[PDB]
Every structure is written in C-alpha cells, then in structure tokens.
Amino acid sequence: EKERFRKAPPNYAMKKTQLLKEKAMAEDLGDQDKAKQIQDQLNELEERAEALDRQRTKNISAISYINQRNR
Amino acid sequence: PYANQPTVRITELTDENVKFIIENTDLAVANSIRRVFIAEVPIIAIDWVQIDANSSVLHDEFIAHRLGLIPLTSDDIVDKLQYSRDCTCEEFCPECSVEFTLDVRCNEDQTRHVTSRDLISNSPRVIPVTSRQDDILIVKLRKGQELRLRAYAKKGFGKEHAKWNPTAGVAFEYDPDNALRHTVYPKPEEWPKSEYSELDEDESQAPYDPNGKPERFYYNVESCGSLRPETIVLSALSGLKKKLSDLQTQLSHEIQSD
Amino acid sequence: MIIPVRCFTCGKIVGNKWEAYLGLLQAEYTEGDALDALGLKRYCCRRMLLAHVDLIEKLLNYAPLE
Amino acid sequence: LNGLTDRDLCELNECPLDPGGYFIINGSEKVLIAQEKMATNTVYVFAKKDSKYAYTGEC
Amino acid sequence: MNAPPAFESFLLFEGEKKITINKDTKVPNACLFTINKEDHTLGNIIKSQLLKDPQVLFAGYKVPHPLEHKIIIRVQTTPDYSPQEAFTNAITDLISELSLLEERFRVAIKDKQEG
Amino acid sequence: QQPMIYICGECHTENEIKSRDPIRCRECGYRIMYKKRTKRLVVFDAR
Ligand SMILES: [Zn+2]
Ligand SMILES: [Zn+2]
Ligand SMILES: [Zn+2]
C-alpha cells in the first residue's frame, strides 16, 4: 500500500528500478510493452543524470575539468 | 666569569615571518632559543571535542584530528589564560578556555565545504585565521549528512603535541662561509653559496680561522598565522627566563634545605 | 583522502590552499608556477599539493540518502 | 554488473575500480588460482636415469 | 597501548624533586646535579655558561636514556669555589643576558616599524 | 519507552523494530538495516 501511491524513483533504488525495468523489457516479448519499458528506463536514466549534474555541478565537475585539461 | 652583551638587528619585518640576526652569543644559547621557538611556546588550540552527531563519511576521530590542527590567533589571549591542568574549578571555564561550536548540514543539492569559518567562537578575539586566502577545509558534506559538535580550546606548547607548534619552519644558520670548518666539503666548488654568504664568487669558502668563535646567528622564524613572529620570539624569551628563574629558585631551596 | 591541515615536515597550513591550487591550475597556470604563486618555498610543503590524492570525491559518490 | 556505467555501480554500493572476477560464497571472496600442468597431446621424450629405461616417451 | 602520555615530559609527579644535589667521592669539589622533567634546552646553555667561567675545571651534562626525562650535570671547580655558587652565578648571568637580549630585540622591533 | 528504532538499508528511513519481529522496512521491503548513533557522551581528545 505504501509503494502504491509512493512513486518509485525516490531515492536510492534508481539503479534497482532501472535493472528491474530492463529485466521486464527483456522478458516481455510484446512491442508496446517493450517500448514503454525502454522509454521508462530512458526517463529514469535522464533523471539520474540530471540529479548527478545538479549535485556534481561544483567541485565534482571542476575536478574532472582540471584533470582532463591537465592530462 | 659572567655573560656577554648580544646584539640584535632585524633585516626583514613582515606579518608572516621575521629575519633577525643575533651577534656576540654562544651557539648553545642560539640552539636553545631555536628549540624553544619550536617546542615551548604557549598558544591556544583545540584539545577537547564533543561530537554529538557526525553523519559524514570520515571517521568519528578524523573530525577531532583535523580540528586540532586549525590554528587560532592568540595575540593577547594566551598570556591571560591559564593551563587547564592548573585550573582551580570544574568544567572548561571560560577564564581558562575558549568554547567553539559547529553546526552545518548540507540541505541544498550541491556539496558543502565545511571550512574553519563555521567555527563560531564565543570570544571575539579567539577566532581561526580568517580575519584578513581561503579557509581551512575541514570536511565535505553532501545532501543528507550533517556535522554537529562543540569543542573547547586550551593553552599548550609544542612539547606536548604538534598542534601547539606556532612556528612553521625556523631557518637557523650561522657562519655562512665555512670558516670554522665545522663541516668539511669534499669538493667545495660543487656547493652553492649561502644566502648570507659575504664571500665573492671566485673563492669557494673562507680560509681557516683557529681562534674564532661562532657568532652572527641568522634566524627566519616563520609564523603559521596564529602568533606573530616577533610575538613568538618574545614569548619564547619570557618562557626561557621563567624556566631559568624556577630552576634557580628550586636550587636555592635545595641548598638551603641541606 | 582529504587534503591535510598542515605539512608533516614543516608545519605550515596547507589545508586552505587545495581549492586555490586547483583554481590556479585550471585557469592557465602550471604546477611549477602555481606552487610558488601560492607561497610554497620549501620543497617539503610542495608534496602536499602534488602527492595528495583526492579520494573524498569517490566517498561522496556513495550518498546515503537521495 | 555487465557493462554497467559507474553511476549505477556507485549507487549499488560498489566501485568501478574493482577488478571483479571473483566468486562470492557465504559472503567470502573466493578466487580460483590458475593451475599449470603438462601440455596434453604432445610427445615428451625424457631420459630418466634412476630407473631401468634409458629413454621414456611420455605422452 | 603502553604509550606514555604527553604531560610526563615537563610536569612533575608527586614526590619527585625538580633538582637534587649529590656530592662525588672520586675528586674533591665535584657534585652531580640531577634535573627531572627537562631536556637539552635547559642543560646545554648552563653547560656553556659554566664553560665560560675560568674557575670551573669541568662541566658537562648527559641524558641517561632518551625516553627517560632526566639529565645529570657534573660540575667541578677549584677548591676555593664551591660548585653550588658556580651554578647559581651561571643561572643568574644567563637570566640577565636573556633579559637584555629581549629588551634589545623589543626596541629593535619597535624602531623597525615605521623607522 | 524505547522501541529500538532502526535505519533502513537503502531507504534510510527510520523504523521501529521490536523483539520477536521480522527485520524489514516499513515500506518497499528490504532485509538490510543499521542502527542509530548512541546517546552517550561521545567525547574525543583532538590529539
Ligand atoms: Zn577554569
Ligand atoms: Zn613542507
Ligand atoms: Zn522493508
């Protein structure tokens, strides 16, 4: 009942949710179901990337920039 | 059968280090003054940290370790406070200690940089080196973590721990030209000239000098930021004088008792 | 894992220079120039900015919540 | 973790630097040491002296 | 686990004396001064100052063991000059010299600032 | 009246687990959970 209304991505199960969606898409032989699962996985990946960018906007990104320019 | 009349001359006076020269003194006194500069110099520092909630990734003791190494300015406070060991009360009284507090919690999305600026001190003059150049980074927190604690500062000297070591590095050097032959260079031509060397670029080292005592000791006391260099020198001299006075008093009492 | 507060050998504060060092290296300056631009004369204090490994980032990657 | 980005690895309490290739039995990292032996289907002609034969064509 | 604390290098323990005099029996007018909770800082200057005095025939300290905080100073003067007064005079003149050095350094600093 | 609160594994959400009860989170449902920091006087010496 809690997970019914509580949306899935929050918060640490992003990788687990993506793996479950990928497994469901692989198991499902249908076309519409596979497309929906792929779209959901892409949306989850984009959300995770945006969250990481927001969190890693400073320091975590500047360090990568300095490392690449130094190499 | 008495002491000598040493002379002093400052060559560079700044707010980070001083380069003075002491002439007409024995080597033992100079070396002792150096070791006092490094070891026996009263200064305030963090020595008692009470951690209430530390959700960071580092160890619980890591926070205390880093906080112990954060310098604190004590230009006019070290001479007033007394050693906690010789206190005549209970709990860290402000008359013999300084209280600190740190309460930071990363709420926004970006990662926090908990610096020394977060140390809110109760006293105005006892603050980390942030008056007048980034601040000492303590730890990095991320959304969801926190670091709440309060610590107290006390007076101590380097002989007890490195936290009470104001001087960064003392450049003690005497007799730039190897005149007293205290060191024998196998190939003098292969060595560079000292910064204080008066010898020309032709000759490698000054000639031998049988009847010659070490004089003109050079110093480069470098303050870490807590105590001023000249203040460090004055405190060291006062402490050495106090130690000699106490030794003399003890010797007099021992002789009288016998 | 994290930049120390003071140099082990000398004792000079070096904790408050890691960010400045990274910024100077990023802008245009090189290492050999940035080190003496920050004010590090002795070679013992220069290892703290060259030898130090910044592993706290990888630790922060494992965020507890959210 | 077959060809998985470092993001998920970090989110799954793992690191991308782990070489991997080790079994997990009862929560213990087990590794199989690569044993070496004599190549099969190859003829070897030794000369054992502490025996009655001058030469031996092992295979 | 058995590492000693940091206060046992300078702080006196209940019952331990800061200084003890002990006369030697091998030669006349020779006493060994044993100091507790000190290091080379407080013995090398005294050794040199004693060396300055011509009436002191012998003067030198040592450290029985680096981990132990103790130093023995052996002094031997002429028969008409006891070593106790020699030690007292060395400490007194050393203190005077340090005070004078401090005053000169202070005046030099105060003159250096805008002058 | 201390019901031995716990912290979930991945959710990091507080849970009240008492004796003779299964070890699971109030939501989703996992099998890993850690404890909370003690309430004692955790005092260190910055040495
Ligand atoms: Zn008190
Ligand atoms: Zn150094
Ligand atoms: Zn659960």
Curated annotation (Swiss-Prot), chain A:
It is found in: Nucleus, Nucleoplasm. It comes from the Eukaryota. Residues 29-63 form a coiled coil. The Plus3 domain mediates single-stranded DNA-binding. Component of the PAF1 complex, which consists of CDC73, PAF1, LEO1, CTR9, RTF1 and SKIC8; the association of RTF1 appears to be less stable than that of other subunits. At least in HeLa cells a N-terminal shorter form of RTF1 is also found in the complex. The PAF1 complex interacts with PHF5A. Component of the PAF1 complex (PAF1C) which has multiple functions during transcription by RNA polymerase II and is implicated in regulation of development and maintenance of embryonic stem cell pluripotency. PAF1C associates with RNA polymerase II through interaction with POLR2A CTD non-phosphorylated and 'Ser-2'- and 'Ser-5'-phosphorylated forms and is involved in transcriptional elongation, acting both independently and synergistically with TCEA1 and in cooperation with the DSIF complex and HTATSF1. PAF1C is required for transcription of Hox and Wnt target genes. This is RNA polymerase-associated protein RTF1 homolog. The gene is RTF1.
